Structures are given as structure tokens and as C-alpha cells.
Amino acid sequence: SVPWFPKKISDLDHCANRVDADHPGFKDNVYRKRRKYFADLAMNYKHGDPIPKVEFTEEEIKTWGTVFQELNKLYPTHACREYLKNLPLLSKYCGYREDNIPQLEDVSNFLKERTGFSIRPVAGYLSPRDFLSGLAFRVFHCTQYVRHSSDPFYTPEPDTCHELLGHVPLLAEPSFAQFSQEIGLASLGASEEAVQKLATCYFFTVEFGLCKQDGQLRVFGAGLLSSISELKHALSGHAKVKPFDPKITCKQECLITTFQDVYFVSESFEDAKEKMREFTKTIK
Numbered sequence: 707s708v709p710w711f712p713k714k715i716s717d718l719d720h721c722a723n724r725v726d727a728d729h730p731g732f733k734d735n736v737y738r739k740r741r742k743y744f745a746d747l748a749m750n751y752k753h754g755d756p757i758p759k760v761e762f763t764e765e766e767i768k769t770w771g772t773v774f775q776e777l778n779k780l781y782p783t784h785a786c787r788e789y790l791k792n793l794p795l796l797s798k799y800c801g802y803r804e805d806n807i808p809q810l811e812d813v814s815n816f817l818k819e820r821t822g823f824s825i826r827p828v829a830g831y832l833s834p835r836d837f838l839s840g841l842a843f844r845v846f847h848c849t850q851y852v853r854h855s856s857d858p859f860y861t862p863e864p865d866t867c868h869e870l871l872g873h874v875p876l877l878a879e880p881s882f883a884q885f886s887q888e889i890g891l892a893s894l895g896a897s898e899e900a901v902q903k904l905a906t907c908y909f910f911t912v913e914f915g916l917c918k919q920d921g922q923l924r925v926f927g928a929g930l931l932s933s934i935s936e937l938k939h940a941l942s943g944h945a946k947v948k949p950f951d952p953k954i955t956c957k958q959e960c961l962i963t964t965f966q967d968v969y970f971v972s973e974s975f976e977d978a979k980e981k982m983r984e985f986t987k988t989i990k
């Protein structure tokens with residue numbers, strides 16, 4: 707039988723709440739209490755609420771600032787044109803600055819106008835099925851906390867810096883928003899195996915994707931765009947690159963503690979969208 711899946715945007719209320727050891731904040735209680743604070747905001751959020759605005763601490767804003775300054779040095783030569791186009795809009799309308807962490811509510815309002823995408827705060831990891839299902843309604847489940855200040859370059863756990871600098875500029879691009887939504891739509895009520903394959907295709911596009919633009923390789927994956935060292939590595943000659951091809955890409959193991967072994971290159975967001983359309987027919 708078909709598994710339960712959301713049928714309207716408010717149905718995400720029933721799944722978005724269905725949620726380390728080497729972590730830099732593992733032994734810090736103040737950090738743990740703060741993370742509990744953010745988790746509770748997500749857990750208590752219901753669709754229709756304004757996303758609670760948070761007063762970030764001086765330590766958190768400096769951590770953001772450090773990440774923000776280094777990444778911005780690289781974007782002009784590493785990011786795709788769509789990312790570079792949208793990033794200045796975020797600074798002007800959402801307060802993206804070295805000394806200010808943007809509020810999810812402001813970013814959500816920006817995206818709703820541009821592409822109909824919206825943000826929902828998420829306490830932690832959801833199942834692949836639940837996470838993908840939000841995309842079907844142009845809802846991106848977003849972390850709201852900040853990485854521990856002891857290591858501003860600690861990336862294996864996504865934080866709000868990753869969401870705001872990695873994902874948000876692309877969600878404001880119509881072609882990318884359509885591509886993303888169609889992953890969500892394909893996942894709705896799909897088999898467990900199909901959800902795994904879509905989640906892997908998502909991983910090697912939305913999170914670690916490369917694209918070809920005017921004969922050059924650029925980066926569009928959010929995970930790369932928020933990771934200083936891997937952003938450089940991905941466009942270096944040391945990275946292994948292969949064509950995005952869902953029936954192949956969906957078999958690739960997703961790595962979390964190290965650089966990817968391989969990166970997949972999409973011709974464009976429209977082409978990646980077309981390839982997924984052909985692929986999803988065979989798994990659903």
C-alpha cells in the first residue's frame with residue numbers, strides 16, 4: 707500500500723517533528739542548552755506561524771562573520787552564475803552581512819515572493835522521505851542554530867550558516883526551485899528504494915552538485931558552497947568528476963566525514979530536471 711504522505715503544506719506539521727561524539731560542542735553545556743533552545747523552536751513551530759526570530763549571540767555572529775568573509779572571497783570564481791546573481795539580492799533585502807546573521811523569517815518571505823519557496827525550521831535530521839516531502843510544497847526544512855565557535859570551519863553537521871549561504875541563493879532561482887520541487891513530488895508515496903535513490907540524486911545535485919557554464923565547471927551544491935576547503939577542492943584538478951546521470955548517480959555512496967570521492971556535473975538546472983523526469987518514470 708502507498709505510505710502516508712503530505713497532501714497540503716500544513717501536513718508537514720505531522721512529519722517535520724519526526725526527528726554526536728566528535729562534535730566540537732559535545733562537552734560544552736552552554737552550547738548544549740543553546741542547541742536545545744533552537745530544537746524547541748523548531749518542535750513548537752506549526753505551519754502558518756512566523757518563524758521565531760532569534761537574537762544571536764556575539765559569539766555566534768562572529769562565527770558567522772568568519773565563515774561569511776572567507777566564503778565570499780571564493781564565490782566569484784567558484785559559484786555558478788545563478789548563485790552570484792541572487793546573492794546580492796539577499797544582502798540588500800535580507801541583511802546578509804559579516805556582522806549580522808539573517809533571520810529565517812525574512813529569508814522565507816524573500817523566497818516566497820521570488821519562487822514560492824518557504825522555510826520551516828527543523829530541529830534535526832528527518833527521514834529522507836519526510837525531508838524530501840517538504841520540497842514537494844516548496845518547503846525547505848532549515849536548521850536555525852550556529853556551529854560551535856571553537857571551530858568555525860567544522861562542516862559535517864549542517865548549521866544555519868550552511869542553509870543561508872549554501873541553499874538560499876539557489877532556492878531563489880526559478881529553474882532550481884522547479885528542479886528541487888520535482889524531487890519532492892517524485893518522492894511522495896514512493897517506495898523505500900525510490901526514496902533512497904531520489905535522496906542520493908538530491909545529495910549529488912542540491913548538496914554537492916557541479917555544473918558546466920560557458921565551458922567552465924562551477925559549483926551549485928549547498929554543501930560545497932558552505933565548505934571553504936571542499937569548495938576549493940571541488941574545482942581543483944584533484945577532484946574526480948563524472949556526468950550527472952541519475953541511474954548511475956543514485957548508486958553512489960554519500961560520504962559525510964570526508965570530501966566526496968566524486969562529484970557529478972549537470973549541464974544546467976533545466977537539463978538535470980529533464981534527466982530526473984526520465985529517471986523518475988522508471989522508479990515510480
Ligand SMILES: CCn1c(=O)[nH]c(=O)c2c1nc(Cc1cn3cc(C)sc3n1)n2CC1COC1
Pocket residue numbers: 828829830831832833834835837838847848849861862863864868905908913928929962
Ligand atoms: C536527503 C538526506 N536528508 C535526510 O534524509 N534527512 C534530513 O533531514 C536531511 C537530509 N539532507 C538534509 C540537508 C543537508 C544535510 N547536510 C549535511 C551536510 C554536511 S550539508 C547538508 N545538507 N537534511 C536536513 C537535516 C540536516 O539538518 C536537518
Ligand SMILES: [Fe+3]
Pocket residue numbers: 864868872873913928929
Ligand atoms: Fe544542505
